[PDB]
Design a protein around this ligand. Structure first.
Ligand code: HEC
Ligand SMILES: [Zn+2]
Ligand SMILES: [Zn+2]
Ligand SMILES: [Zn+2]
Ligand SMILES: [Zn+2]
Ligand SMILES: [Zn+2]
Ligand SMILES: [Zn+2]
Ligand SMILES: [Zn+2]
Ligand SMILES: [Zn+2]
Ligand SMILES: [Zn+2]
Ligand SMILES: [Zn+2]
Ligand SMILES: [Zn+2]
Length: 82
């Protein structure tokens, strides 16, 4: 499982690789991942739940597209470690 490959396939269109939302992402309500305060206050579980369930009118759920292993592999990408 390549976490970054999954991110480029499924997430990049709203959350850019640099840790900054795209124009589309920001319009829907996304904020920066590249933020020390956000990273410090956000648990892995919150990240996993967000990928799994999304947010109505903002982010689609990915639970029916990705396995728990694949969702977990995305955590160190969101964290900025690749
Ligand atoms: C645009 C249609 C999006 C795609 C594709 C992905 N995400 Fe997203 N995400 C989007 C918005 C508008 C928001 C804000 C909504 C909210 O309730 O916070 C988000 C949010 C996140 C978060 C934040 C959770 C938190 O508690 O702050 C994470 C960690 C996140 N999104 C990750 C993520 C991943 C890994 C994706 C690919 C599988 C992905 N998102 C797709 C918009 C969009
Ligand atoms: Zn890679
Ligand atoms: Zn895929
Ligand atoms: Zn997709
Ligand atoms: Zn980002
Ligand atoms: Zn802005
Ligand atoms: Zn900050
Ligand atoms: Zn962690
Ligand atoms: Zn819990
Ligand atoms: Zn709990
Ligand atoms: Zn919750
Ligand atoms: Zn939310």
């Amino acid at each position: 499982i390549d976490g970054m490959k999954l991110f480029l396939q499924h997430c990049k269109t709203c959350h850019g690789v640099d840790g900054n939302p795209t124009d589309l992402g920001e319009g829907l309500g996304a904020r920066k991942f590249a933020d020390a305060e956000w990273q410090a206050k956000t648990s892995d579980e919150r990240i996993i739940e967000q990928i799994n369930e999304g947010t109505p009118e903002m982010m689609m759920p990915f639970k029916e597209k990705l396995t728990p292993e694949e969702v977990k592999a995305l955590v160190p990408v969101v964290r900025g470690f690749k």
